[PDB]
Design a protein around this ligand. Structure first.
Ligand code: A1IAA
Length: 103
């Protein structure tokens, strides 16, 4: 699959990016007050990595949905001028541009 070939490329790039540090594992709701209540569908790169390694994606659109969810969740919970928020903006611009550079 050439669709699954690119998400693999773009995920590897997001995983190693400098600004990826808030998105490499799930947010622990025990550690973050309010997170369970505000964020209905948590998402992160390791979860996307797991879903890829298992064959859980069918189309690249499903992959795109999960990527965008990471950044929608980031902007729903974090302030744009917060440390995690700034990192999410850098990561979201990277994803959007890289995704468009292919499709
Ligand atoms: C208060 C900010 C919490 C947060 C992180 C975050 O700090 N992590 C990600 C998981 C563990 C990482 C650790 C340093 N290894 C750090 N990431 C996100 C998306 C959030 C939020 C609330 O949206």
């Amino acid at each position: 699959h050439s669709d699954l070939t690119f998400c693999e490329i773009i995920l590897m790039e997001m995983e190693s990016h400098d600004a990826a540090w808030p998105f490499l594992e799930p947010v622990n709701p025990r550690l973050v007050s309010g997170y369970r209540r505000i964020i209905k569908n948590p998402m992160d790169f390791s979860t996307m990595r797991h879903r890829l390694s298992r064959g859980g994606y069918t189309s690249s659109e499903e992959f795109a949905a999960d990527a965008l969810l990471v950044f929608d969740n980031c902007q729903t919970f974090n302030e744009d001028d917060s440390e995690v928020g700034k990192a999410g903006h850098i990561m979201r611009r990277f994803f959007e541009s890289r995704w468009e550079e292919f499709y």
